Specification:
About 25% of the residues lie in helices and about 20% in strands. The protein is an alpha+beta fold. It is globular. The two termini are about 35 Å apart.
Length: about 220
């Protein structure tokens, strides 16, 4: 029977052991154990699940230390990703001299704690359960492909071909509009263009394969 961490995890094994303690419990049960009330619609408190997990993952403090990025991931009653996963915002101006090494994507992705949560809309927020957590780092072959995708997409962005981008660019990573708003960028001629703000995303089949791995034998 779970209890929130009296202090932040001092190691990633401590952080994972706790995350695993919340598997099977619903957001409503986890909030009731901490004196919180689950909204009836997340749209009113857009960042509610994040605060709750942070309270449980140790000290609200009224993971940057451990070097592990926490990422919730919406899944179905079977634990498979419902959608595309957002990594970070893709800036269309002022990203020169930036590399894969000093990129926020690689940073945020170097070591991740995936926390599956049933994200199916029709399910009352309070009845959505936490799945099985998974600490993950891209292997050398995945990290080369992530670099290939990041360099390609940033190349297009800076070369003035952001509108030329589709889901066909990048095997793992993807750039999709972050969704009214328009952000400034560079065109095919180098001219100024207004466009939909963008973000780096990970394909569904990618987060899908990684959560499913440990199940397979032979």
């Amino acid at each position: 029977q779970p209890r929130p961490l009296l202090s932040p995890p001092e190691t990633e094994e401590q952080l994972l052991a706790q995350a695993q303690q919340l598997s099977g419990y619903t957001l409503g049960e986890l909030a009731a154990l901490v004196g919180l009330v689950t909204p009836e619609n997340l749209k009113r408190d857009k960042g509610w699940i994040g605060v709750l997990l942070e309270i449980w993952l140790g000290a609200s403090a009224g993971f940057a230390a451990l070097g592990v990025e926490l990422k919730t991931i919406p899944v179905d009653s079977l634990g498979r990703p419902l959608e595309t996963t957002f990594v970070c915002v893709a800036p269309l101006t002022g990203n020169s001299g930036v590399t894969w090494e000093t990129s926020h994507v690689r940073h945020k992705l170097k070591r991740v704690l995936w926390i599956p949560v049933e994200g199916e809309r029709s399910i009352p927020l309070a009845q959505r359960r936490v799945g099985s957590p998974l600490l993950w780092s891209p292997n050398e072959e995945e990290d080369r492909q992530l670099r290939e995708d990041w360099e390609e997409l940033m190349d297009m962005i800076v070369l003035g071909q952001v509108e030329r981008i589709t889901a066909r660019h990048g095997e793992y990573l993807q750039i999709r509009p972050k969704a009214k708003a328009l952000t400034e960028a560079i065109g095919a001629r180098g001219e100024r263009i207004l466009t939909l703000p963008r973000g780096f995303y990970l394909k569904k089949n990618f987060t899908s394969a990684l959560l499913a791995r440990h199940f397979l034998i032979q």
